[PDB]
Design a protein around this ligand. Structure first.
Ligand SMILES: C[C@@H]1CCN[C@@H]1C(=O)NCCCC[C@H](N)C(=O)OP(=O)(O)OC[C@H]1O[C@@H](n2cnc3c(N)ncnc32)[C@H](O)[C@@H]1O
Ligand SMILES: C[C@@H]1CCN[C@@H]1C(=O)NCCCC[C@H](N)C(=O)OP(=O)(O)OC[C@H]1O[C@@H](n2cnc3c(N)ncnc32)[C@H](O)[C@@H]1O
Lengths: 260, 260
């Protein structure tokens, strides 16, 4: 008669946010299976784009159009970058590779290096961004992924104000159609941050520099910047209950169960 | 009087393929520094796109337009996938992470899984592709990167012929403006391959299935497929002498030295 907790977990795997007893499990499951197959058939017939890849392209266009240079830097980075980031906590979260390398947990160290290098070539202000994989060993699963995709944009030189930072953040999220509020906060690496929140979900940490860490990276100018999780953004935008629906995954494609 | 080998290495870092004694080092270096700064100033003023990101978007459009579903699957994969790929050589090249995981050296295992899963939902033939980071510990540096980007497209069910495989390969490279020849070859994992060559550079390995490995992955249909290195393609297309100019890098941006 009543659904078991296991049967309910199974149907919840198959349930999309848009979907609207005493029908048996097998018929509810069969109905959901049929709707999800059709969802995939529709993607496949019409658009064929992955949400994560698509979101990356749309964000890329946004920042290129606003004068930010698109970076593609290494994902596998020297372990020394972590120490030079002032990380020794987040330190338990580092995936190490070989004796000397690790999977980057953030984009900041490589973007510090690009900021310094490009200051020799490019006019003030220097505007750059990267979108790409980042990795953190994580105990949670509801808002945390071990493998995720971060956007980090930043500017250095003139115009590096808190007002300009907030304005970019605001134009960005309004462009994406994502509701937010900007709250003051802090963390170990940076300060002193602004946190961009969706209800109780952190979409972004943002910082108005300078900060004392800059000197370690050969940086001696004002800067502003923010990092956003693309899977968090997708999660809010598609109203996914679990962030795993927005991840690189063999179990979900565009938030649709692939176990059909 | 004559340039030292070190000075010549330095100028070669600064030399682009398009650039056309007895001028001293310092003046040749100063001239090249000036041209490279201007190259970066021009990217930054006009397009602002990274070559690797841009090539990915263009390839994505190509395959989406031809009816292939865009996949984004994990980069960090179970070590068991390597063994189930029949790899135990390429095995010394695997970057391991934790006891149970590794950085994927190829896209094939996750695409095998997607082929099987999607066969329950999608009409025949099933056409899919992924573009993304792959990792192999490598002794060479001239045509090999430890961190690279592979494209793998594939089809399963009807139309999985050698002729159709070659036609897609041909339309693809002609679209990209890349000269090639298709040669028969073989490797340990697959067969029996077709190798897509640019002079002596391998652009792609391609396979007409079925093969006995399929059964390990729950696959019992004809398939065709190919994997291309995006950095190899960029290398040919931009006439870069070294493939490091085409990599995710803090030393090169669009093949331009960032050490200016
Ligand atoms: C780049 C310049 C030069 C130096 N630094 C500058 C800069 O711009 N700094 C300003 C702040 C940038 C971001 C900072 N480095 C950072 O890593 O912030 P976090 O808050 O730790 O990560 C940013 C976002 O990534 C997402 N994220 C985090 N961990 C996860 C997870 N495990 N699963 C899924 N999503 C997650 C989440 O949305 C989070 O708000
Ligand atoms: C996906 C379906 C389901 C199962 N398999 C199917 C399939 O489509 N198989 C057909 C063949 C696909 C490719 C095969 N798995 C593979 O890994 O081929 P490789 O030749 O080892 O790699 C393909 C290309 O990646 C590039 N590449 C390689 N190593 C490097 C390097 N270290 N640095 C830079 N570039 C490199 C290089 O261009 C090479 O030609």
């Amino acid at each position: 008669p009543a659904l078991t907790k296991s049967q309910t977990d199974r149907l919840e795997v198959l349930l999309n946010p848009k979907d609207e007893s005493g029908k048996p499990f097998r018929e509810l499951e069969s109905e959901l299976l049929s709707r999800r197959k059709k969802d995939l058939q529709q993607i496949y017939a019409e658009e064929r784009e992955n949400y994560l890849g698509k979101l990356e392209r749309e964000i890329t266009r946004f920042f290129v159009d606003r004068g930010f240079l698109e970076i593609k830097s290494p994902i596998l980075i020297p372990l020394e970058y972590i120490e030079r980031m002032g990380i020794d906590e987040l330190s338990k979260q580092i995936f190490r590779v070989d004796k000397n390398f690790c999977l980057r947990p953030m984009l900041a160290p490589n973007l510090y290096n690009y900021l310094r290098k490009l200051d020799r070539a490019l006019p003030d202000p220097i505007k750059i961004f990267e979108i790409g994989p980042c990795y953190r060993k994580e105990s949670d699963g509801k808002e945390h992924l071990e493998e995720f995709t971060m956007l980090n944009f930043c500017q250095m030189g003139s115009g590096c104000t808190r007002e300009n930072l907030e304005s970019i953040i605001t134009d960005f999220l309004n462009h994406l159609g994502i509701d937010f509020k900007i709250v003051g906060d802090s963390c170990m690496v940076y300060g002193d941050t602004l946190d961009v929140m969706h209800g109780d979900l952190e979409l972004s940490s943002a910082v108005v520099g300078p900060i004392p860490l800059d000197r370690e990276w050969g940086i001696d100018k004002p800067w502003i910047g923010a990092g956003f999780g693309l899977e968090r953004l997708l999660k809010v935008k598609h109203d996914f209950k679990n962030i795993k629906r927005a991840a690189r995954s063999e179990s979900y494609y565009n938030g649709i169960s692939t176990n059909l």
